[PDB]
């Protein structure tokens, strides 16, 4: 009641709960999704073998 979830009033007239700018903070989970992984091109070994 003091903070006002979506289902109830906050009692702090003129205020509302903050809105997240990102749905999920786990970027790895989003990146490791099947859709993105299929749409993402393959990557290399991440280490450049020395040449000459």
């Amino acid at each position: 009641q003091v903070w006002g979830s979506e289902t109830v009033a906050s009692s702090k007239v003129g205020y509302t709960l903050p809105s997240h700018i990102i749905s999920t903070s786990d970027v790895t989970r989003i990146i490791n999704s099947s859709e993105i992984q299929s749409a993402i091109r393959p990557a290399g070994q991440a280490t450049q073998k020395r040449t000459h």
């Binding site: 709960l17 903050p18 997240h20």
Partner: protein
Amino acid sequence: SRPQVTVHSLTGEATANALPLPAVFSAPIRPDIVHTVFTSVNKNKRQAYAV
């Protein structure tokens, strides 16, 4: 749904009664905002000094 933390009696026994989260704990954690607000709130309790 919204998980509910079980009520613990004075003896530490997990009582069957539980309450859903008030949704406040799902708010966006902003360490920068908290630090900036603290750096100014902590200055409100001060007394002036001069020579």
